[PDB]
Amino acid sequence: DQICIGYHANNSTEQVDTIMEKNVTVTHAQDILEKTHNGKLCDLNGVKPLILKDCSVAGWLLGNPMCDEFIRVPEWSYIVERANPANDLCYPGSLNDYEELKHLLSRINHFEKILIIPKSSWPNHETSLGVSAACPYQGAPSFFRNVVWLIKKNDAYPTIKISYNNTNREDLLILWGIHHSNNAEEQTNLYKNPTTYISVGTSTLNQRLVPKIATRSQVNGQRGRMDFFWTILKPDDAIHFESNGNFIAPEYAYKIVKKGDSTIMKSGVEYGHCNTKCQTPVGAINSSMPFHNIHPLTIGECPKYVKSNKLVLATGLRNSFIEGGWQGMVDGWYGYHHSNEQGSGYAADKESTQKAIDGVTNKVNSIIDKMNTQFEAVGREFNNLERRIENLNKKMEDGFLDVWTYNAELLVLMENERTLDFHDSNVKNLYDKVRLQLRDNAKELGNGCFEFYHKCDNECMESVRNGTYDYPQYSEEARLKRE
Amino acid sequence: DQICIGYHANNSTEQVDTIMEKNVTVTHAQDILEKTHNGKLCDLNGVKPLILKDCSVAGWLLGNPMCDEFIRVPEWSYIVERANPANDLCYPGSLNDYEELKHLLSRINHFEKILIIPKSSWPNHETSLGVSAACPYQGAPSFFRNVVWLIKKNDAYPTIKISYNNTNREDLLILWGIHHSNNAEEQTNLYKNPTTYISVGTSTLNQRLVPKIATRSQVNGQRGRMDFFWTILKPDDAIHFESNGNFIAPEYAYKIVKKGDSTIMKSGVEYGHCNTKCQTPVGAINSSMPFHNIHPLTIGECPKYVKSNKLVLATGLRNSGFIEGGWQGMVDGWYGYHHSNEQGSGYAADKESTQKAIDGVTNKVNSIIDKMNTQFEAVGREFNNLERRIENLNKKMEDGFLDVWTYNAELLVLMENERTLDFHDSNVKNLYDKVRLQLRDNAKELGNGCFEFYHKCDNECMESVRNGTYDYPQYSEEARLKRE
Amino acid sequence: DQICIGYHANNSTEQVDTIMEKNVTVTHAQDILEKTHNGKLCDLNGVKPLILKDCSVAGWLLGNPMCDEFIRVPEWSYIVERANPANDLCYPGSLNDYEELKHLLSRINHFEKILIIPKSSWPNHETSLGVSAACPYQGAPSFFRNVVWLIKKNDAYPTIKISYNNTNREDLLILWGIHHSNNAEEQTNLYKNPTTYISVGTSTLNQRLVPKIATRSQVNGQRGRMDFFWTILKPDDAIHFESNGNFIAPEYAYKIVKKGDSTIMKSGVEYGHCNTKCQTPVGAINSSMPFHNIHPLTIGECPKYVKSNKLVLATGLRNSGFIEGGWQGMVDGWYGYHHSNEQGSGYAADKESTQKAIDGVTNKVNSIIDKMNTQFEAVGREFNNLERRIENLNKKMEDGFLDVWTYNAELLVLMENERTLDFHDSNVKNLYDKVRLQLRDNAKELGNGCFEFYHKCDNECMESVRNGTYDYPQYSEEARLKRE
Numbered sequence A: 001d002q003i004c005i006g007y008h009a010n011n012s013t014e015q016v017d018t019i020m021e022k023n024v025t026v027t028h029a030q031d032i033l034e035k036t037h038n039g040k041l042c043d044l045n046g047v048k049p050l051i052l053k054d055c056s057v058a059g060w061l062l063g064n065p066m067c068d069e070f071i072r073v074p075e076w077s078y079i080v081e082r083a084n085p086a087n088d089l090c091y092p093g094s095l096n097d098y099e100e101l102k103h104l105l106s107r108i109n110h111f112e113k114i115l116i117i118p119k120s121s122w123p124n125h126e127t128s129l130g131v132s133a134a135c136p137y138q139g140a141p142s143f144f145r146n147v148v149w150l151i152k153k154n155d156a157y158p159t160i161k162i163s164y165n166n167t168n169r170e171d172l173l174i175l176w177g178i179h180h181s182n183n184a185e186e187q188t189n190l191y192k193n194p195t196t197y198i199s200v201g202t203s204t205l206n207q208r209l210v211p212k213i214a215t216r217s218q219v220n221g222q223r224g225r226m227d228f229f230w231t232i233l234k235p236d237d238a239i240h241f242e243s244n245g246n247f248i249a250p251e252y253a254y255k256i257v258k259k260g261d262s263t264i265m266k267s268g269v270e271y272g273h274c275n276t277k278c279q280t281p282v283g284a285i286n287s288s289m290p291f292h293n294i295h296p297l298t299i300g301e302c303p304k305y306v307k308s309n310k311l312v313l314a315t316g317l318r319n320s321f322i323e324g325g326w327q328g329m330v331d332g333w334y335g336y337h338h339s340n341e342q343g344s345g346y347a348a349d350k351e352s353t354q355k356a357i358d359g360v361t362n363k364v365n366s367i368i369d370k371m372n373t374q375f376e377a378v379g380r381e382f383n384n385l386e387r388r389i390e391n392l393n394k395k396m397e398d399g400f401l402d403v404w405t406y407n408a409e410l411l412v413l414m415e416n417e418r419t420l421d422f423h424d425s426n427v428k429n430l431y432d433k434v435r436l437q438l439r440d441n442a443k444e445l446g447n448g449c450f451e452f453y454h455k456c457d458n459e460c461m462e463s464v465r466n467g468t469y470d471y472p473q474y475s476e477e478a479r480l481k482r483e
Numbered sequence B, C: 001d002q003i004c005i006g007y008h009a010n011n012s013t014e015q016v017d018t019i020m021e022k023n024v025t026v027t028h029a030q031d032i033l034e035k036t037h038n039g040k041l042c043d044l045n046g047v048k049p050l051i052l053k054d055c056s057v058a059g060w061l062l063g064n065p066m067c068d069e070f071i072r073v074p075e076w077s078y079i080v081e082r083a084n085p086a087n088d089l090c091y092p093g094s095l096n097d098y099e100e101l102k103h104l105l106s107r108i109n110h111f112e113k114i115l116i117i118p119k120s121s122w123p124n125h126e127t128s129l130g131v132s133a134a135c136p137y138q139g140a141p142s143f144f145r146n147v148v149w150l151i152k153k154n155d156a157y158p159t160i161k162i163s164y165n166n167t168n169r170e171d172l173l174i175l176w177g178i179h180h181s182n183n184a185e186e187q188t189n190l191y192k193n194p195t196t197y198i199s200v201g202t203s204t205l206n207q208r209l210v211p212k213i214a215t216r217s218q219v220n221g222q223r224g225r226m227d228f229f230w231t232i233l234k235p236d237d238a239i240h241f242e243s244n245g246n247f248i249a250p251e252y253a254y255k256i257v258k259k260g261d262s263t264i265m266k267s268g269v270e271y272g273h274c275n276t277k278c279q280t281p282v283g284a285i286n287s288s289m290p291f292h293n294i295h296p297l298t299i300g301e302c303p304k305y306v307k308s309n310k311l312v313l314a315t316g317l318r319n320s321g322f323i324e325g326g327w328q329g330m331v332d333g334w335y336g337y338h339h340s341n342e343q344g345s346g347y348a349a350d351k352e353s354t355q356k357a358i359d360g361v362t363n364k365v366n367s368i369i370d371k372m373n374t375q376f377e378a379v380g381r382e383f384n385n386l387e388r389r390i391e392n393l394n395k396k397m398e399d400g401f402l403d404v405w406t407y408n409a410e411l412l413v414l415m416e417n418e419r420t421l422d423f424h425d426s427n428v429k430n431l432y433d434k435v436r437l438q439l440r441d442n443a444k445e446l447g448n449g450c451f452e453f454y455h456k457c458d459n460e461c462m463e464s465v466r467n468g469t470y471d472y473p474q475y476s477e478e479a480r481l482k483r484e
């Protein structure tokens, strides 16, 4: 007659690694890496992205004839641009501090186009001839919608002197431009005056632009260029313009209220009519895990980006003193095996099992819950002449990856070694617990099993489970069986 | 007739957490997170803050009339500027590379204002009428004090050609400016000549400033602007000024000796006449504790900022099997025995042990605290409105490190808290196995950590077991079969 | 008779630290910190760096007379510059976006000099008189080799209009410059035209340069300055020049193919005809170790840089059986046995237990080493004097990362060394318990980890664990009569 101690086993093929052991099959495990995304582009905390479709921020702000004319959405969480937008600046040129405009515009609380300078103004200049085949619309030379390319009237370009006082109680993005002529004959044809200037002045601005009449290479069929510039007029200030030529005037402006920052995402994915707290260019993440492998460039409260393909934490017994585990036990992690004629089968320690499941559950939940995330946009906004600042971002991003990867990977290895010793310690505690309540009525064979001199009743079996066994009641019976 | 092995207990209400257990009341513990600051702005390593008050670094340098600081301080460790300094540039304008000047001027070993171009010079120009109500002094038109606004004399502005050769052994901070006049008449009225220029040349500097005459908005009452520029003249180089008009010319300059860096702090806290190693905008920290939760923007040899509100390590043991419940009675040690016989009773501690524990856990707390390597650092923002992307780059780094330290520090507590408690469970079990290894046949195992000696328990064998000199042949036959 | 379980000890003086103990002497150890370097500058992944000697990138590119005319380096992995390169820009001036050019030119797959505008292309201008003392070859006045200083011919300077179309299939780096004169007399003398300009236009480039004529101090004996600019002409684009004076024209240009980035290294070490994955200014590293301390500014796949002098992991035993005994005698194993019978006395090892620990300890070492195989390429420093704020950003970052790696590395070594030592303690106790679980009634526990044999024992009887199930009743009667 005998009794043994044992641990649970199942069909699980899940394999974990420890700091000292590799490829250890376990009964239960948990991965703390999120590898899943929804594959769509969603709202971020209830606000929809501004999806510019084959347009750039420049083509949308200035009025590229082939960009959407109306701003349907008054607010966005992020701007979604295609990798190499097709439309941009139809008339070749430049937009000043473009990348900083895009950061300001990446998340806007309120956006609303308003007419600031009506074409009714400029009665002595021409408002109708300012078109180019570079900016085509419906088979006709057109031009940017929200600015005006003024031209000479009757071989006369009177100097312009115009002001706009912001009465709107909100900041105003205002845009203007300079046309760089290509020869001295072209200059006088478009603007009678041969030497020209643009003077822009606000409370914070003092600008003089002068054309650069020079030979350049054709882009979009034109050798001319247009350089655009922008300012924000604060709620009760004025902007003052003066020019005798080469003035791409403002017609429409945009009311801006800004309370937050995010980034421009370069993605071809499509809107999914969903909501998310974490967004990648490949898709959105719905996870509470600490780490992920979906994409570097995320927006929102996102898991940490690591280089690991799997991060699996053992939460159970090793699966096959006791030579092996009991596939037969089906009601607890730690248990007893009884052998008497009255009955046969297995049994399991209720309290010890729940203590351990709470133990490993709290170990996992801590690792997950201790991670706190800051809303952050990992997008990158730098020019061809800002490539040294680009590497700082790369160094930062890459360094945190190497940190988060090494820490997460060794946390798993270390804590799995602790998780496994935790199990084998609990079982031996039950073995010794039985050994002390069975001092002389038992012998040790070394296989986690005792030798019953006494005849253990099923009630005795349960009396030893409770620990309510009385050794005096059966001490003499052992002396009889012995020798 | 039994002897029991047990551990210490007290009245502690302090709780710690571990990976597998939460809200566990323990006897002794230590918090490695510092939360307290002195509420005042202090000196740093024995050097004093340049507490500029309601005046910008620009206003003080150029000599805004409304600021009472001239050569008050010759050495500083950090600058304190208010969030929106009231005075700044009294005449509307700008200062080029201001944010970089504030970095250069952030820590200066030697600063001295020296007159460099005297008003005795410029004898063909008017040095007396260069005032504006924008710069007001005591209700009367005034101007910046370390610079001279030169206007016409006798309806003439002869061209200025002047030079200054640094005869000092220290580098010099020299400041000049340009007036952008509002209309063609105001140009002629202030400087006879209609079209003007400012050339500035050194060994590194080649400048040409031309005025921008344009309609602009009224700031501090004037539609005009003055834009200021700066250079550092090396010890035997010379600066060369040529101007037709519109020249704001240097009268004074500053001798500069720089040997380190430390940002501009934004605070309204006041000088406490103290010294610190670590300065927050809300106060100062005097701790060896490795982590802190007071302010992000710290200047000095500082701990590491975390989002934690509590980072309590556990130095002792648990509080109310081998010890079904701990004994509150023991006051002299962490690990100890209890004797039960008519001769005597009570709880008695161990000395080879208990101190071994104290020494080991305390070395653990010190090892965590000591291995933090402190780098003097300045966390402060010096980025303007068109440098927000570099500013986000800064915030991403700052936030990335916060999240790195917070996670590791909290898991380190949770992980090392479990090992501490299991260390204590291990220490008790060793002594129980030693008592069983001494007495073998003469006593029986009860199972509650309380050995039962069939033979009468001896106060004299107590210290004997404590040391292991107990003799079992002495009482072998005695109570060989005491029960039947 | 007697049998005893013990562990190994040797002559090792190697000491380690745990979280709870300090200077613990161990039998075996392993350092995961690399301190050895090659002491020379090597190839980086099979590609030889460009060592520019005492010429700067500007001097090499523009053709300082005192530099190698050209070199057979079409490809290079990084650029090695001296701390203060001597030759640089002989004629005083500037190169625009120099630090970005050095980044672009830092790793280049194809670099070839080609002649884009011949001296034949300047019929009505002088190609030969454009020389200066500041730029000297053999004491003789010379000038930059790859650009042409064009001056008047026949007291006349007809305005220039030249265009170059990049027929090649690679990008071209093109350089040009403007000459700032000193006085109006200088201007007319070299360029009859008093008021001059330079327009440069490509598909993306729209430039107007105009000379600044002012007095400046002497640098390299000349008070004038020459400011240089660059662009990258794309295949099938054209560059269009126009000037009536002060034009330092392009003569040669560079065919560039760029596929990567890798900083300029400031170093004086000599080339070693070696190859390495990691290069340091002091020398090269050939290590798989996770961390190092050789120098911060490394380029290549490199260990993490920490502030530690040693990071020693315990891989062995505590060194001076299971109770208070380190056996120097058993050289044959790690865990082992000692027998004391009438046959003799000697030492034995347990191979099934010794190997289980060696395999596990090597995994501890290997896991810590190999899990940080997230080595990536890296860089050094590249910012100017008006870029100190961005330079601080770099420093806060690489310092902050240093504080993260050193604190994490050291605690890991302290934590796992504590765990290693405890892991050895549990192994011997299980050997003791194996021998204890067998031979239960036939032996006496003496308190030293050694058992007392009541019955007589043979060398063959011990048999270590070879049998492992020595007959419980074969000698049970003999020990029953050995009782008293």
Ligand SMILES: CC(=O)N[C@H]1[C@H](O[C@@H]2[C@@H](O)[C@H](O)O[C@H](CO)[C@@H]2O)O[C@H](CO)[C@@H](O)[C@@H]1O[C@@H]1O[C@H](CO)[C@H](O)[C@H](O[C@]2(C(=O)O)C[C@H](O)[C@@H](NC(C)=O)[C@H]([C@H](O)[C@H](O)CO)O2)[C@H]1O
Binding pocket: A129, A130, A131, A132, A133, A134, A141, A149, A151, A180, A181, A182, A186, A190, A222, A223, A224, A225
């Ligand atoms: C309409 C056209 O194609 N014109 C074309 C001209 O036309 C040929 C002519 O040479 C030949 O003798 O007779 C043919 C009929 O039998 C036919 O009429 O061919 C010359 C060949 O070199 C072209 O240059 C010329 O094209 C115009 O050239 C202009 C100057 O170079 C300029 O590039 C014109 O482009 C526009 C544009 O579409 O952007 C024309 C716009 O109306 C004009 N807008 C404004 C507000 O002025 C715009 C502007 O001038 C420039 O963009 C400013 O830099 O240029 C191009 O059609």
Ligand SMILES: CC(=O)N[C@H]1[C@H](O[C@@H]2[C@@H](O)[C@H](O)O[C@H](CO)[C@@H]2O)O[C@H](CO)[C@@H](O)[C@@H]1O[C@@H]1O[C@H](CO)[C@H](O)[C@H](O[C@]2(C(=O)O)C[C@H](O)[C@@H](NC(C)=O)[C@H]([C@H](O)[C@H](O)CO)O2)[C@H]1O
Binding pocket: B129, B130, B131, B132, B133, B134, B141, B149, B151, B180, B181, B182, B186, B190, B221, B222, B223, B224, B225
């Ligand atoms: C001088 C004056 O009071 N001007 C005044 C103007 O004319 C008055 C008139 O109202 C009164 O009836 O009779 C006076 C004669 O006794 C005189 O004719 O009235 C207008 C009404 O709107 C006032 O705005 C005007 O004020 C002056 O206007 C100037 C030009 O716009 C200028 O803004 C003056 O400000 C100063 C300044 O205080 O900054 C005056 C300084 O002395 C002057 N400093 C220097 C070195 O030249 C300074 C300078 O011109 C500009 O800052 C350069 O841009 O301007 C303001 O008082």
Ligand SMILES: CC(=O)N[C@H]1[C@H](O[C@@H]2[C@@H](O)[C@H](O)O[C@H](CO)[C@@H]2O)O[C@H](CO)[C@@H](O)[C@@H]1O[C@@H]1O[C@H](CO)[C@H](O)[C@H](O[C@]2(C(=O)O)C[C@H](O)[C@@H](NC(C)=O)[C@H]([C@H](O)[C@H](O)CO)O2)[C@H]1O
Binding pocket: C129, C130, C131, C132, C133, C134, C141, C149, C151, C180, C181, C182, C186, C190, C221, C222, C223, C224, C225
């Ligand atoms: C020709 C000469 O040596 N000039 C010399 C001048 O006159 C000497 C005199 O000292 C000596 O005693 O007798 C000589 C006759 O036998 C002659 O009369 O003396 C002054 C005294 O200070 C010297 O500075 C002066 O030296 C020249 O001065 C120039 C104007 O300041 C200029 O700096 C000359 O430098 C060069 C140069 O080497 O860079 C001369 C180059 O040929 C010239 N190159 C071109 C393409 O024009 C170059 C150019 O003018 C400037 O760099 C443009 O800014 O300047 C220097 O020798």
Ligand SMILES: *[C@@H]1O[C@H](CO)[C@@H](O[C@@H]2O[C@H](CO)[C@@H](O)[C@H](O)[C@H]2NC(C)=O)[C@H](O)[C@H]1NC(C)=O
Binding pocket: B165, B166, B236, B237, B238, C217, C218
């Ligand atoms: C400023 O004056 C000093 C002292 O005169 C100049 O330094 C040189 O000093 C020697 C001896 O004192 C003089 O003989 C030289 O004339 C000076 N060198 C030169 C090249 O001028 C210093 O250079 C002067 N600075 C300038 C550029 O005016």
Ligand SMILES: *[C@@H]1O[C@H](CO)[C@@H](O[C@@H]2O[C@H](CO)[C@@H](O)[C@H](O)[C@H]2NC(C)=O)[C@H](O)[C@H]1NC(C)=O
Binding pocket: A217, A218, C165, C166, C236, C237, C238
């Ligand atoms: C420089 O030359 C190349 C090849 O001539 C130019 O590319 C064009 O080649 C096509 C071939 O069908 C010609 O029809 C066009 O005339 C060429 N020019 C254009 C404007 O497309 C290249 O464009 C020329 N570069 C410049 C800007 O002049």
Ligand SMILES: *[C@@H]1O[C@H](CO)[C@@H](O)[C@H](O)[C@H]1NC(C)=O
Binding pocket: A010, A011, A012
């Ligand atoms: C493994 O055992 C579980 C019992 O819960 C069973 O549901 C599952 O189907 C088994 N898997 C296989 C492949 O038999």
Ligand SMILES: *[C@@H]1O[C@H](CO)[C@@H](O)[C@H](O)[C@H]1NC(C)=O
Binding pocket: A165, A166, A236, A237, A238, B217, B218
């Ligand atoms: C604009 O008008 C507001 C009142 O509407 C006035 O306070 C302000 O001075 C004006 N701004 C300018 C500079 O024209």
Ligand SMILES: *[C@@H]1O[C@H](CO)[C@@H](O)[C@H](O)[C@H]1NC(C)=O
Binding pocket: C011
């Ligand atoms: C340690 O012992 C071994 C074997 O006897 C020997 O090879 C080695 O030289 C010894 N090391 C020292 C420092 O004595």
